[PDB]
Amino acid sequence: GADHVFNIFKDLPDHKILEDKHYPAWLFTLDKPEKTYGELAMTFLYGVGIENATLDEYLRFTRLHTKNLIKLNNMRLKKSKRSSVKPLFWDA
């Protein structure tokens, strides 16, 4: 009946599992932990590994830097007692 997991329509079969060779390559790569802002900063601000830098790392660092800037501004402009700020942020 309604025991399906990949089906919402009426009178249709459920999605079956296939072999790994059928799925996209990229599908089996998401398990890895992505680099953190701390790690990425060492390569661009300091130049630890700039000789082996990549466009994806540059894009991730550019996004994470603006994230930090906005979180900084909000930290300072915060007034309320509501628990919404990471303890690390407070150490600034």
Partner RNA sequence: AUGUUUGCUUGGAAGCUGUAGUCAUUAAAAA
Partner RNA sequence: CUAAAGAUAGCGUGAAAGCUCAAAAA
Partner RNA sequence: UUUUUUUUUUUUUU
Binding site for other proteins (CB under 8 A): 1-3, 5-6, 8-10, 12, 15-18, 22-23, 26-28, 30-31, 36-39, 41-42, 44-48, 50-51, 53, 55, 58-59, 62, 65-66, 68-69, 72-73, 75-79, 87-88, 90-92
Looking at this protein, which amino acid is placed at residue 4? Answer: H
Question: Choosing among other proteins, RNA, none, which partner's interface includes residue 57 (Cβ < 5 to 8 Å by kind)?
Answer: none
Helices 37-44 and 55-77: angle between axes, nearest 10 degrees? 120
Residue number with CB closer to RNA (15 or 68): 68
3-state class of 83 per DSSP?
A: coil
3-state class of 82 per DSSP?
A: coil
Residue number with CB closer to RNA (11 or 19): 19
Question: Choosing among RNA, other proteins, none, which partner's interface includes residue 56 (Cβ < 5 to 8 Å by kind)?
Answer: RNA
HEC string for 24-62: CHHHHHCCCCCCCHHHHHHHHCCCCCHHHCCHHHHHHHH
